[PDB]
RNA sequence: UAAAUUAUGGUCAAUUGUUAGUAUUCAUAUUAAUUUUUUUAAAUGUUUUAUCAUUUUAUAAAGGUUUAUUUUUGAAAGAUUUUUUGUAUAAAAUUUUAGGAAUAGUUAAUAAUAAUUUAUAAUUUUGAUUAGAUUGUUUUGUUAAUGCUAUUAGAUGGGUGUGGAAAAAUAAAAAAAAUAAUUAAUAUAUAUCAAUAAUAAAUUAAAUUAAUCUAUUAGUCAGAAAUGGAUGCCAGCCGUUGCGGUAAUUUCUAUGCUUUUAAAUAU
């Protein structure tokens, strides 16, 4: 009728493998394709102007977060994880990061405000 | 929250995790005392370097751990300051003694991990001596100049343009790589000359130039001028 | 003869797929996959029976 | 017999070999160069293109040998102190060599292409290889160092201390004191040489 | 199969063991040998020795095998209706599979696929493939069609022979037409006063008496539409004179005067002294019976204000290329066919000069 | 044996060769792309490939339907797979032939790590394991000093009965204390005492 | 045998399985397997003159 | 991994090496029957449901599965299963319609044995040849009426006795003496 | 999506969408340029499309007619076998 | 195993019930004493059933609902269900 | 053409649309996650198997150490590995003959393999997108353009038939004496 | 109605309960499950367009179905100066209730017929129709094994009938007509039915990036393990024979002692 629980606890040793600890040849991908940051335009002079012209959606209230960025380089140095640390909500931070990388590609944050 | 429970990622370098009650419990039953036989300071005949790598100020502050209390095999993770490259890190003495573990930067010190000293490349002091002055000055610049010019060491430099400090690779800075390793970006030398933030402007000069000349820009230009007896196979086209 | 041979989720225990081609022609199912009502519950029946057991021919 | 249907003409194909065709060749389909070592491919590519083709395997092999003579020249005298707390271990060279020899001879990795390269790649001073290992056996027997792990007696308490690759210290295991020279280890070294 | 929490298709082909990070046995640093054997590897049932699927488990005799020899003859029959549907489909696919996207070679593909599917490639399919390929100016693939037909032991009708001789002439290879002649059209006759003119269809078509049905083995009752059965009745209209003409053309094309003189003389003599055979009505399958439509809803000729659009109801553009204004060659009298034959020979002289 | 059967030690192998790259019309703009961090292996699968039964025929360089592998080195080149890498894509194969020298067998005393062999952690010291009945161990590299023909293979193909067996049941139902024969173990004490151990 | 199927006893399961047994199936000889007794003696008092159209 | 024990499990997300990725459906649930009716009044005339009812088809024990191999597939090569059937003509009351009784096969793998079942079909005979008690060949075809997908392909055995019986003005076969069974007692005398 | 910038022709309407796609000539020129570049990509892309098409067709020819070779031999063998079994019969 | 004793667990291992009565009943000889039997109520598919079960539990400060588990047999004939805890 | 559109997962055209090669896997902890290269229709249903044309392969996005090959002092080989299984007969069929579509991630993969050029979405943000003017392009074109027939024949060999018959195999295939 | 050999070949079938005269698959066993424990999910605003419009965006609400669910290319793929084709809606098998009777817009012929065309009609005891229960024909568990025992979910009529196809009224995790984005896989605190966590459960330490967790039960007659103290057919124990009658190794309590160490107990 089985009230007694399992007959054995199967456990395997941990025995470190000298072959898996062997040094790994590494490259940094910043060596293969070098990272860089685009300098501000007259269109987008500040990080705050940027967060203003990337604000389109009612639910992507980008302009409200201006204080959570200290300067220009701070913006383009952010990635999504470290962007979550700073307490920006979800779809908002995706809007932000998307905008940034888009500006990096040569597409400035010029888009019509859909709120109305 | 919920997601707090997730185990972190354990990459290839790192051995056993000890994240579970089962994994914690048997080591919780080990209690160490420092006798004369365990004390690090007695063993300076061997481990002298390891002794001079310890942060004597910071460890007694944060960890409340005296330097006379530290075993040669000590499992506690204490603060270190690298006596080569001068960077701070936190590890256990046991791991530096049993195998060599130390500052993560000096792992990549040699040009390739697979073969440690096998480089035939000259040092930085020789091949590109003009780099030694751009190193951010911690006082260890004479040790960093000693490295291979092909070295993958991650070093910090003071940018010429804005005078600030950024972090790049020695070989990325020189451009030279060892035969049989992976080629870097052809432009890497020009691109790592400055900050990641200061780099754009100078390297956008020749492009504006080439669209000034011909009124048209294609990245093709370099490869074209590479063009101005090659063995080739018989073909089945006929 | 054992439990492992009960699991047909191995490809080694299961009559292969191509048989259904050999009976109905090659690439015949690509038609069936685009059908209006599919897989709820039912799909156009897939005939796989080892070719020495075929009732038709043998 | 002759009731029920006429005899299918294709039956003829059994008794008459005239009708067995294949309209096309094996690789006329565009695969002709699949076999790297076929004479057809040697005729199509020519020799210098085949050199270009296998250069990568040649430099693989040269890489193995270069590593080997680096380790040999490093650890050749078996006992010295080459680094901070690290000292020479013949065992390093040994185990690398075994990795090599397994690349060649093992049936799990079987990489045998490595051996087709020897008549070229192989260094002239490494031709004698087991001879060099015997010389290392002779150097390994020095008195100041432990007969088992070859660490120095004065500066070191245990077998395997401060060695990255040591067998003698395993994860949750214990430290073993240095073992001392005497007839036991003398004839151990001897049997190894043998 | 895919994308589910329990998805089996991803595990069904072999993979090297993954240790990127800790999978619960701390696989990044841990040597998994015993863990490999006793846990990770599938076993016959819980606790039994690991079940080995590797290459050493199967016998040697799997690699001793020639290709496709595991196959057995498959008799697949199907409804008569479905045969018509399928043959039609293959026909219109051999003509063209896609609009400008069709490669010439695709006709050959579709013929082959037709065989691979256990259908018999009837005469219409062969003629169609050959005409398509030749009209694409690709002559090797045409002969490849013929060789496929020969390998299937399908006896070519007179029409098929015509097509293949057209390919021969345009290729200018006499050595093909010779073997083709020798094998198939030898006994081909002309029509004389004592001949009966278009011969009635004599075939029974295939049925089974109840004793044939019950007592015979499975294969004797298996009827797949087989070209060979009606070959007699495809030939019932006597297209022979065409074959003789083509053959004259070939012997000329390959530069041989005696043989050409022979065929052309036979042909001439017969055309003068023997009755004109009754022509066959248009083949339903090669060319399609026009179906009735009202032409009312059509883009008018002037539909586009910028030009003259040709229309389904009438042609306003005018003929792009002059047409000869003669009925299909088989509708000629015998004297007319003599004339036609000479003009044909001349045309081949011209073609050979241009090659 | 070596003189009479020369072909039993393989001296030949399919050479690792570099494939020609497909031309990229986009030019330098995309040339960075295929050059990356890692190696990328690609093995083919399909109806004609991946079947263990046919394995040698599929690795046979003479066969033109031979299964295709490729590798992108981090610098962007492409090369054919080394034979090891080819064999990685088949279910693991065990070769041991017992006919001349004994192949090394798994689940032994000196093989099996602690937790499977005993249900307790036993320290691994290279000196004096009483449980394993050995006096001492010098620990050379396993296959170095031994002759190569002597190395035969490994055999895992059986149940390790101390560890895990089929159809596990209680040997004796009463008294309540006995379990299946795989549960052997020393008694855990009343609550643990930890003696400080530099000593 | 799962205990929820058919009756609370076991043998009820095998009594309904005899309904599906292959060699027990209903045919021209064995008929009305499930209720034989409702149809018993049903036509005793039903007088039917048999059908003859031939002398 | 279904071959690993209860205690041997580490990760529930993947198969480490190979094998079958298996979801455990919980077979032992102790499912029960709820009793909503009095044993006296159950709301059905012919049958009563007092326990848990086994469900599914082919999931049904003991398994009864389609058997392709029988007389019909023995004689015929069928393009589609049931495209040919041999049977007897039972009744013609409908113009151009022959009803046909036919046998097919079922296999019980538990007992390893076959049973013959029987089924009626409507077949279309244009021109009305079929007399009750003919042995006929029957084929699948175009939908003809609501229930007729089959047509009479060939008469294997005609009924010579029945035809001569008709020619004399009599019915092909004498009408069955008793009809369907009843649960009543009919007292009908003289 | 189709990107609608802010300097597109603003539609003044309260009954519908606020911005009509209509382009400043600059935007048109720009769009043309970008699209030229992607044309460069898709040229090679579809080139590879039809290349693989003929590759696959050719392999089908060769393997399928090898198949027809082996298969016909097989069914010829079976047919011979049968008519023999019937002579024996 | 006796499967009809479990009738009111309805395929579940444990039940929740409300207290109504507590009376006493005398076990089958040769066992003498008083067995405490609690008379409980619970509802399923909006039917209210009166369950009758053996009180082996510990009552503290006054409480209402119990947890019912089925056992083996007990001294007292006719009482299948037993008490685990009181809430 | 749904009255109330399914808002979250829109597409183009009616479903099922033209087959598209996708990467998809069930979501889980990042440590175990794999992907499937799958040819399927444009409009998926609840379970991805309902519309699934073919199964192209498994792709594991975890760099791995190569323990299958012997540890090799060669620098490049000891970079980590990324493993993927491609079915390329089905791929060339579907892509080439059936004219598929492609999502971007599978495109990056098949680019790494050498089946396709690198995608449209792979951007070194170092270089800009190029400029164009027609007169300069024209000067370059007039500078280099090959002969018409050469080009026509190249298009012939690439697009139409490749395997052709040299005069030799003609001579070897044409019948000999008794029927010649 | 004769043996066989050029010798282990064609790749592993193997069953573990301490019972109580005897007959009969039936309490206490192992494996699998429910009892059982927040490490894999997720928030609203779909989108263009020529402007009150028109293009793109087709199967998770419920009801309970066992002779049952079946289909095209005219959309997209799709290549091209204009017409171009044919194949489809149909069936066959497998179908549950302990004790069993009739069912019905109704069969077949005619035909773009007939709320009253013609006929000796159709379904059923070879188990119908109503009525109960139930989401149908690669998924599980046990097992040496023909078996037994699971498998979700998803197609619920018509009524200006749009659309290639009704699948058309919250509940995505399918990039949806300019490269939005790929340095991305992280999603905070919600849910539905799933997704097995006591992951070296105890001595030498983590080739880290140090982040989540402070973690315990049972027995003590039979059968590993007992003594005091109460209690006195009472109170209570009860997997089971049975125990409790002033000496209870079987209740309660205290203390020790026993265990082969992911727990007892219930189903
Ligand atoms: Mg359990
Ligand atoms: Mg089973
Ligand atoms: Mg029950
Ligand atoms: Mg009792
Ligand atoms: Mg629904
Ligand atoms: Mg019902
Ligand atoms: Mg049916
Ligand atoms: Mg139907
Ligand atoms: Mg409605
Ligand atoms: Mg005892
Ligand atoms: Mg008790
Ligand atoms: Mg007393
Ligand atoms: Mg006592
Ligand atoms: Zn350092
Ligand atoms: Zn700077
Ligand atoms: Zn030592």
Q: How far apart are CA J59 and CA J63, in angstroms?
A: 8
Sign of CA dihedral B176, B177, B178, B179: negative
DSSP state of H121: E
CB pair distance less than 8 Å for A16 and E31: yes
H55 CB neighbours strand L below 7 A: yes
**Opening angle at CA F171, ends F170 and F174, nearest 5:** 80
Q: Which two tokens stand for residue E171?
A: 């290729």
B9 touches chain D (CB under 8 A): no
With contacts defined as CB-CB under 8 Å, which chain D residues touch F83?
109-113
Write down which residues 153-172 in H have CB closer than 7 A to strand L: none
Backbone angles phi, psi at B56, to 5 degrees: -80, -30
Q: How far apart are CA K81 and CA K64, in angstroms?
A: 5
- For residue H144, the distance in angstroms to the closest alpha carbon of chain E comes to 16
Select from K74, K162, K163 the Cβ nearest to the Cβ of D60. K74
With contact defined as beta carbons under 8 Å apart, do F31 and F24 qualify?
yes
DSSP state of B131: G
Task: State the count of interchain CB pairs (< 8 A) between A and E.
Answer: 25
Which of H14, H18, H23 to mutate to probe the K interface, most K CBs <10 Å?
H14
With contacts defined as CB-CB under 8 Å, which chain K residues touch H14?
28, 32, 34
**In sequence order, what are the beta bridge partners of F40?**
F72, K82
With contact defined as beta carbons under 8 Å apart, do E108 and E96 qualify?
no
- CA-to-C1' span, I10 to L52 (A): 17
Cβ burial of H46 (10 Å; 0-12, 13-18, 19+) is exposed
With contact defined as beta carbons under 8 Å apart, do I67 and I61 qualify?
no
Q: How far apart are the first and last CA of chain A?
A: 68
G40 CB neighbours strand L below 7 A: no
**H or E stretch including B88?**
strand B88-92
Ligand nearest to the CA of J56: 11
- For residue A55, the distance in angstroms to the closest alpha carbon of chain I comes to 12
C12 touches chain H (CB under 8 A): no
Q: How far apart are CA F29 and CA F24, in angstroms?
A: 10
User: Which of helix, strand or coil describes residue I77?
Assistant: helix
Q: Which two tokens stand for residue C58?
A: 């043998």
Tell me how far CA of residue A27 lies from CA of A30, B164, D67, H56, in angstroms: 9, 25, 21, 59
Q: Which two tokens stand for residue E53?
A: 């699927």
Tell me whether residue H30 is annotated as binding: yes
- CA-to-C1' span, F171 to L28 (A): 15
A22 touches chain E (CB under 8 A): no
Number of CB atoms found within 10 A of residue B157's CB: 21
Q: Which two tokens stand for residue K11?
A: 């597409």
- Technique used: cryo-EM
Number of CB atoms found within 10 A of residue K93's CB: 22
**Opening angle at CA E325, ends E324 and E328, nearest 5:** 95
CA F147 to chain CA mean position, Å: 21
I5 CB neighbours strand L below 7 A: yes
D28 touches chain I (CB under 8 A): yes
With contacts defined as CB-CB under 8 Å, which chain B residues touch E20?
12
With contact defined as beta carbons under 8 Å apart, do B47 and B13 qualify?
no
Give Rg (Cα) of chain A.
24
Tell me how far CA of residue C5 lies from CA of C12, E52, E154, F55, H25, in angstroms: 9, 13, 47, 22, 19
| DSSP per residue, D57-83 | HHHHHHHHHHHHHHHHHHHSSSS---S
Number of CB atoms found within 10 A of residue D157's CB: 14
Which residue of chain C is at minimal alpha-carbon distance from K54?
A: C30
Provide the positions of strand L that have an atom within 7 A of a protein CB.
Answer: 9-19, 25-35, 38-53, 56-60, 66, 68-73, 75-80, 82-102, 107-110, 119-155, 162-189, 194-215, 219, 223-225, 233-244, 257-267
**In sequence order, what are the beta bridge partners of H117?**
H104
Among B27, B16, B78, B28, which residue's Cα sits nearest to residue B53? Answer: B78
Find the nucleotide nearest F178 (Cα to C1′). Answer: L260
- The residue with tokens 């397997």 is G33
Q: How far apart are CA E110 and CA E97, in angstroms?
A: 9
Find the nucleotide nearest F180 (Cα to C1′). Answer: L260
Backbone angles phi, psi at E297, to 5 degrees: -90, 105
- Could you tell me which residues come within 8 angstroms of residue F171 by beta carbon, excluding any fewer than 6 positions away? F178, F179, F180, F181
Find the nucleotide nearest E61 (Cα to C1′). Answer: L10
**H or E stretch including B34?**
none
Q: How far apart are CA K58 and CA K33, in angstroms?
A: 11
Q: How far apart are CA J23 and CA J19, in angstroms?
A: 12
Cα C44 to ligand 6 centroid, rounded to whole Å:
27
Sign of CA dihedral F35, F37, F38, F41: negative
Among E179, B105, B76, which residue's Cα sits nearest to residue A26? Answer: B105
**H or E stretch including H64?**
none
Among B24, B137, B27, which residue's Cα sits nearest to residue B86? Answer: B137
- For residue B30, the distance in angstroms to the closest alpha carbon of chain F comes to 7
Tell me how far CA of residue E50 lies from CA of E57, F111, F113, H12, in angstroms: 13, 18, 19, 20
Q: How far apart are CA E176 and CA K171, in angstroms?
A: 11
Q: Which two tokens stand for residue K96?
A: 């080439």
With contact defined as beta carbons under 8 Å apart, do A56 and A112 qualify?
yes
With contact defined as beta carbons under 8 Å apart, do E177 and E247 qualify?
yes
Helix pair angle (D90-105, D129-139), 10° resolution:
160
Helix pair angle (E105-116, I25-88), 10° resolution:
40
User: Which of helix, strand or coil describes residue H173?
Assistant: coil
Q: How far apart are CA J36 and CA I37, in angstroms?
A: 90
With contact defined as beta carbons under 8 Å apart, do A100 and A113 qualify?
no
DSSP E strands, chain K: 20-24, 35-40, 54-59, 81-86, 101-102
Reported resolution, Å: 7.8
Number of CB atoms found within 10 A of residue H102's CB: 19
């Amino acid at each position: 009728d089985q009230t007694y629980g399992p007959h054995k606890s199967y456990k395997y040793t941990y025995m470190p493998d000298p072959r898996k600890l062997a040094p790994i040849e590494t490259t940094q991908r910043s060596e293969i394709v070098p990272q860089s940051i685009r300098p501000p335009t007259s269109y987008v002079p500040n990080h705050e102007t940027f967060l203003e012209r990337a604000d389109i959606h009612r639910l992507r209230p980008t302009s409200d977060f201006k204080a959570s960025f200290k300067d220009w380089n701070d913006l383009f140095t952010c990635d999504k994880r470290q962007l979550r640390v700073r307490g920006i909500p979800r779809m908002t931070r995706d809007a932000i990061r998307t905008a940034v990388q888009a500006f990096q590609n040569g597409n400035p944050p010029e888009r019509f405000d859909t709120k109305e | 929250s919920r997601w707090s429970s997730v185990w972190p990622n354990m990459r290839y370098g790192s051995m056993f995790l000890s994240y579970s009650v089962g994994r914690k419990l048997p080591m919780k039953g080990v209690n160490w005392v420092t006798r004369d036989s365990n004390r690090l300071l007695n063993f300076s005949n061997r481990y002298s370097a390891v002794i001079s790598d310890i942060d004597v100020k910071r460890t007694e502050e944060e960890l409340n751990v005296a330097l006379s209390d530290i075993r040669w095999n000590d499992h506690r993770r204490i603060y270190w300051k690298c006596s080569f490259c001068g960077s701070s890190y936190r590890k256990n003495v046991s791991v530096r003694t049993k195998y060599h573990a130390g500052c993560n930067f000096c792992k990549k010190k040699y040009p390739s991990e697979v073969r440690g000293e096998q480089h035939g490349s000259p040092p930085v002091s020789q091949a590109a001596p003009e780099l030694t002055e751009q190193l951010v000055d911690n006082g260890k610049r004479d040790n960093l100049a000693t490295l291979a010019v092909t070295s993958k060491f991650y070093a910090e430099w003071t940018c010429r343009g804005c005078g600030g400090s950024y972090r790049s690779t020695i070989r990325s800075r020189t451009g030279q790589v060892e035969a049989g390793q992976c080629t870097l970006h052809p432009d890497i030398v020009a691109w790592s000359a400055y900050c990641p933030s200061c780099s754009w402007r100078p390297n956008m000069v020749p492009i504006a130039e080439e669209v000034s000349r011909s009124g048209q820009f294609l990245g093709l230009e370099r490869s074209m001028e590479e063009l101005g007896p090659i063995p080739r196979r018989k073909r089945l086209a006929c | 003869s054992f439990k492992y041979a009960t699991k047909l989720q191995h490809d080694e225990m299961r009559q292969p797929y191509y048989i259904h081609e050999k009976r109905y022609g090659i690439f015949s199912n690509e038609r069936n996959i685009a059908k209006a009502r599919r897989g709820l519950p039912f799909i156009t029946p897939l005939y796989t029976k080892h070719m020495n057991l075929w009732d038709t021919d043998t | 017999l002759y009731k029920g249907i006429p005899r299918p003409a294709i039956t003829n194909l059994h008794y008459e070999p005239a009708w067995r065709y294949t309209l096309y060749q094996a690789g006329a389909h565009g695969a002709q160069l699949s076999n790297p070592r076929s004479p057809f491919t040697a005729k199509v590519l020519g020799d210098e293109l085949m050199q270009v083709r296998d250069i990568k395997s040649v430099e693989h092999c040269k890489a193995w040998f270069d590593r080997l003579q680096y380790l040999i020249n490093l650890h050749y005298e078996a006992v010295g102190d080459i680094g901070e707390f690290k000292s020479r271990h013949t065992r390093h060279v040994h185990e690398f060599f075994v990795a090599f020899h397994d690349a060649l001879s093992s049936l799990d990795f079987r990489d045998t292409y490595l051996f087709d390269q020897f008549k070229a790649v192989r260094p002239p001073e490494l031709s004698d290889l087991f001879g060099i290992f015997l010389e290392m056996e002779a150097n390994y027997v020095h008195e100041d160092y432990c007969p088992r792990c070859s660490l120095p007696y004065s500066t070191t308490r245990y077998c395997g201390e401060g060695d990255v690759d040591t067998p003698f210290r395993k994860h949750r295991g214990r430290w073993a004191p240095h073992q001392k020279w005497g007839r036991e280890w003398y004839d151990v070294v001897a049997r190894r040489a043998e | 199969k895919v994308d589910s929490f329990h998805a089996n298709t991803q595990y069904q082909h072999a993979w090297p063991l993954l240790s990127h990070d800790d999978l619960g046995n701390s696989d990044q640093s841990n040597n998994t040998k015993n863990i490999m054997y006793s846990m990770y590897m599938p076993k016959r049932n819980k606790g039994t020795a690991p079940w080995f699927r590797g290459a050493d488990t199967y016998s040697v005799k799997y690699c001793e095998q020639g290709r496709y020899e595991y196959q057995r003859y498959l008799m697949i029959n199907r409804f008569p209706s479905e045969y018509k549907k399928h043959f039609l489909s293959f026909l219109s696919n051999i003509r063209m599979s896609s609009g400008s996207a069709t490669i010439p070679q695709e006709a050959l593909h579709w013929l082959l696929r037709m065989i691979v599917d256990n259908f018999n490639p009837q005469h219409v399919h062969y003629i169609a493939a050959m005409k398509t390929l030749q009209s694409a100016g690709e002559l090797d693939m045409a002969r490849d069609v013929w060789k496929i037909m020969e390998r299937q032991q399908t006896w070519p009708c007179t029409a098929t022979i015509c097509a293949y001789l057209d390919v021969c002439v345009e290729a200018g290879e006499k050595t093909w037409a010779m073997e083709a002649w020798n094998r198939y059209c030898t006994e081909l006759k002309f029509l004389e006063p004592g001949e009966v003119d278009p011969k009635p269809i004599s075939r029974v078509p295939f049925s089974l008496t109840r004793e044939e049905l019950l007592y015979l083995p499975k294969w004797k009752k298996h009827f797949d539409h087989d070209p060979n059965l009606d070959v007699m009745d495809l030939n019932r209209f006597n297209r022979t004179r065409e074959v003789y003409l083509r053959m004259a053309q070939v012997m000329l094309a390959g530069g041989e005067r005696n043989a050409f003189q022979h065929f052309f003389t036979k042909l001439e003599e017969a055309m003068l002294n023997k009755p004109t055979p009754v022509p066959e009505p248009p083949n339903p399958h090669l060319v399609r019976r026009p179906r009735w439509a009202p032409y009312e809803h059509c883009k008018s000729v002037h539909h586009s204000p910028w030009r003259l659009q040709n229309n389904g109801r009438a042609l306003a553009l005018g003929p792009p290329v002059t047409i000869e204004d003669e009925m299909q060659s088989r509708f000629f009298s015998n004297d007319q066919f003599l004339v036609h034959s000479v003009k044909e020979v001349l045309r081949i002289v011209l073609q050979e000069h241009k090659r | 044996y070596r003189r009479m059967f020369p072909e039993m030690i393989g001296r030949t192998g399919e050479p690792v060769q570099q494939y020609g790259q497909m031309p990229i019309w986009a030019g330098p703009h995309r040339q960075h792309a295929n050059k990356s961090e890692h190696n990328w292996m690609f093995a083919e699968i399909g109806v004609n490939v991946g079947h263990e039964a046919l394995k040698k025929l599929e690795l046979d360089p003479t066969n033109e339907k031979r299964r295709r592998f490729v590798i992108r080195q981090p610098d962007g080149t492409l090369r054919s797979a080394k034979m090891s890498e080819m064999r990685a894509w088949y279910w693991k194969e065990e070769w041991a032939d017992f006919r001349f020298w004994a192949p090394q067998m798994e689940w032994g005393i000196e093989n099996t790590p602690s937790q499977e062999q005993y249900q307790e952690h036993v320290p691994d010291t290279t000196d004096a394991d009483f449980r394993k009945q050995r006096r001492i161990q010098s620990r050379p590299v396993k296959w170095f000093y031994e002759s190569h023909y002597t190395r035969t293979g490994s055999f895992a193909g059986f149940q390790p009965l101390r560890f895990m067996q089929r159809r596990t049941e209680r040997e004796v139902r009463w008294p309540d204390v006995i379990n299946a024969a795989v549960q052997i173990q020393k008694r855990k004490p009343a609550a643990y005492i930890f003696k400080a151990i530099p000593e | 045998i799962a205990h929820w199927y058919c009756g609370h006893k076991f043998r009820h399961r095998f009594m309904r399985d005899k309904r599906f047994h292959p060699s027990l199936q209903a045919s021209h000889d064995a008929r009305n397997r499930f209720s034989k007794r409702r149809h018993f003696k049903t036509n005793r008092w039903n007088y039917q003159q048999a059908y003859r159209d031939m002398p | 991994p279904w071959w690993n024990f209860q205690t041997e499990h580490r990760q529930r997300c993947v198969l480490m090496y190979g094998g079958a990725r298996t979801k455990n459906t919980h077979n032992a649930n102790h499912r029960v029957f709820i009793k909503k009716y009095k044993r006296n009044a159950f709301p059905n005339r012919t049958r009563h449901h007092w326990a848990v009812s086994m469900t599914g088809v082919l999931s049904q024990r003991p398994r009864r599965m389609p058997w392709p191999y029988d007389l019909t597939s023995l004689i015929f090569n069928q393009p589609r299963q049931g495209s040919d059937k041999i049977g007897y003509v039972v009744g013609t009351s409908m113009l151009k319609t022959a009803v046909v009784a036919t046998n097919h096969m079922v296999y019980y793998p538990k007992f390893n044995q076959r049973v013959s079942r029987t089924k009626r079909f409507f077949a279309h005979d244009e021109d009305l040849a079929c007399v009750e008690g003919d042995l006929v060949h029957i084929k699948q075809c175009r939908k003809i009426s609501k229930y007729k997908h089959y047509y009479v392909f060939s008469i294997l055995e005609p009924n010579v006795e029945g035809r001569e019986r008709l020619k004399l003005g009599l019915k092909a076969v004498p009408p069955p003496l008793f009809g369907y069974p009843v649960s009543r007692r009919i007292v009908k005398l003289n | 999506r189709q990107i609608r910038p802010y300097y597109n022709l603003p539609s003044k309407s309260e009954h519908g969408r606020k911005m009509t796609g209509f382009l400043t000539p600059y935007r048109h020129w720009m769009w043309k340029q970008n699209e030229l570049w992607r044309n460069v990509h898709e040229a090679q892309f579809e080139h590879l499309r039809r290349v693989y098409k003929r590759q696959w067709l050719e392999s089908f020819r060769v393997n399928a007619d090898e198949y027809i070779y082996k298969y016909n031999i097989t069914k010829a063998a079976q047919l011979a076998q049968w008519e023999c079994e019937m002579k024996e019969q | 195993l006796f499967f009809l004793r479990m009738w009111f667990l309805y395929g579940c291992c444990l039940r929740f019930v409300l207290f109504v009565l507590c009376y006493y009943m005398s076990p089958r000889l040769p066992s003498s004493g008083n067995r405490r039997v609690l008379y409980a109520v619970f509802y399923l598919y909006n039917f209210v059933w009166m369950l009758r079960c053996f009180f082996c539990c510990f009552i503290g400060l006054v409480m209402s609902l119990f947890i019912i588990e089925g056992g083996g047999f007990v001294d007292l004939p006719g009482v299948k269900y037993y008490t685990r805890i009181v809430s | 053409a749904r009255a109330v559109i399914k808002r979250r997962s829109p597409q183009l055209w009616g479903a099922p649309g033209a087959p598209i090669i996708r990467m998809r896997g069930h979501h889980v902890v990042w440590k175990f996650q794999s992907y499937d290269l799958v040819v399927e229709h444009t409009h998926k249903r609840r379970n991805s198997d309902i519309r699934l044309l073919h199964y192209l392969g498994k792709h594991c996005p975890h760099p791995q150490k190569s323990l299958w090959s012997p540890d090799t002092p060669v620098a490049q080989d000891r970079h980590l590995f990324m493993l993927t299984t491609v079915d390329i007969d089905a791929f060339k069929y579907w892509f080439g003959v059936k004219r598929c579509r492609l999502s971007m991630k599978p495109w990056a993969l098949l680019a790494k393999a050498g089946l396709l050029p690198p995608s449209l979405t792979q951007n070194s943000k170092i270089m800009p997108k190029p400029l164009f003017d027609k007169e300069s392009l024209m000067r370059y074109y007039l500078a280099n353009r090959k002969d018409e027939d050469v080009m026509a024949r190249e298009k012939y060999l690439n697009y139409e038939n490749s395997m052709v018959k040299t005069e030799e195999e003609r001579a070897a295939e044409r019948p000999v004496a008794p029927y010649l």
